[PDB]
Symmetry: D2
C-alpha cells in the first residue's frame, strides 16, 4: 500500500466549503469527485490525479496533484483547475495546495485565461 | 467522441524537449506518460488528467489539465507537477500551459515548496 | 490623500513572522522596508510598489503590489520577490497576497527559477 | 553603477506589443512607465521596482521585479500587476517574466481575484 494511501483516502473540505472526495491507490493514483461551493459549478465533477506513494520519512509532506474539468451533466464552464500541493498527516491532517484555473479563450484573450490561488483542505468542517 | 479527442490524442513536445504522450477519452479523461528532458527525472512517468469534451465553438481553446507525480521504477523526486492550459487546434496545433511543481517539505520549508512556470507543446520537434 | 493611504501606511506582519514597513503616498506610491523571517535574508531590504489610490466604494478591496530585491549591505541572494494582492480595511485589516520569487539562473536552469506562494499580512503579531 | 544598469535602462517590448520604459539606478531602483496593448488600460502608467545591482558572474541572469497599479488620469481598472523575472544580457537581450494581476474584489469573489501569466520583453519590435 502507498505510505499515505490510508491518510489521503476520504472526504476533505476547503476554506470555501468545497468538498473533495478521493481514493488513493497503492500505485500513486487519485480518483474521486469535487464539488465547488463557488463559481460556475453545481453538483459533483470527476477528478483524477497522482501522489507520491513512497514519500521521504523525515516529517516531510507528501507531494500530490489533481485536475477537475468543469463539465458535468448540469453545466459546462469551459475550464479546468489543477491543484498542486502536499499532504501533511497527523491529528490536524491537511492538504496545502496552490491551483491554476484555465478557461478556454480566443487567442486575443489568452493573456487573461488563467487564475491562480490557494486552498487548504482539512478532514473537518 | 469528445470534440478535440482526435486533436489532443498523440505525442507532444515542449520547448525543453520533454515528451508528453496522451490519450483523450470521449468522457473527458486524459491518460498517458511524461518524460522530462530536465530535472530529477528519467524515463517515463504516469500521468492523468481531464479536458473539456464539449468546448465553445467560437475559435475558443479547449481547457485541460494533468498531473505527474515524479516517482517511477528508477527515481523518486518526492514532487508532483500539474499543468493547466488550453489546446488550440489547426495546422500549428498547440497546448499552452502554466504549471505548478510542488516538492514535499518540512513545515519550516513549506514557504519554498512550489515552483511555477509555463510550457508550450507542439506536435513537431 | 489616497482613500486607503492612512489604512495601508504602517507596520504589517505575515504568517511567517516577517515585518513589512510601508508608507503609502497620495499619488499611489508604496515605499518602505521588508525583513524576512525565512530564507537567505537578514535585516531590512528596500521595497517599492504601487496601490490603487481611488478604489471601488462597494466593500471591494484595494489592489496593490510591491517588490523586494534580496540585496542589502549584509547579503545578496540574487533574487527578487513581488507581492500582488489586495488591502481589506476594518477592525481586522488584512493585506492578502500571492507572490513570485525569481532567482537569477543559467539558461539551462531557468525552468526552475521561480517560486510561487501566498502571504497574509495583519497589523498585529 | 549597477552591473546591468546600462543593459536594463531603456525601452522594452513584450509579445503582446506592450511598451515598458525603465531607468535602472545604481542603488537597485527601477522607475518608469508601462503602456499595455491589452486590457482595461490606455496610455502610460507609473511603475516602480527593484533589481539585483550585483548579480552572479557565471552566465546567470539578473533578478528583478516591478509593479504597475492600473490607475492613471484616463482610467482606473482597480488592479495591480507585478512582474518577477530575470534580465539576460547580450545581442538578443531579454527580460523573462512571470506576472500576477490582482483586481480589487468583494470577500465573496476574492478566490477569483488573481490572474497569472508570463511576458518576454525584447529591445526590438
Amino acid at each position: 500500500m502507498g505510505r499515505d494511501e490510508a491518510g489521503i483516502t476520504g472526504t476533505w473540505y476547503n476554506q470555501l466549503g468545497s468538498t473533495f472526495i478521493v481514493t488513493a491507490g497503492a500505485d500513486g493514483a487519485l480518483t474521486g469527485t469535487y464539488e465547488s461551493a463557488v463559481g460556475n459549478a453545481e453538483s459533483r465533477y470527476v477528478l483524477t490525479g497522482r501522489y507520491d506513494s513512497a514519500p521521504a520519512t523525515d516529517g516531510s509532506g507528501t507531494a500530490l496533484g489533481w485536475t477537475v474539468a468543469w463539465k458535468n451533466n448540469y453545466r459546462n464552464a469551459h475550464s479546468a483547475t489543477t491543484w498542486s500541493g502536499q499532504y501533511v498527516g497527523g491529528a490536524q491532517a491537511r492538504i496545502n495546495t496552490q491551483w491554476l484555473l484555465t478557461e478556454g479563450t480566443t487567442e486575443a484573450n489568452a493573456w487573461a485565461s488563467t487564475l491562480v490561488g490557494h486552498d487548504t483542505f482539512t478532514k473537518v468542517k
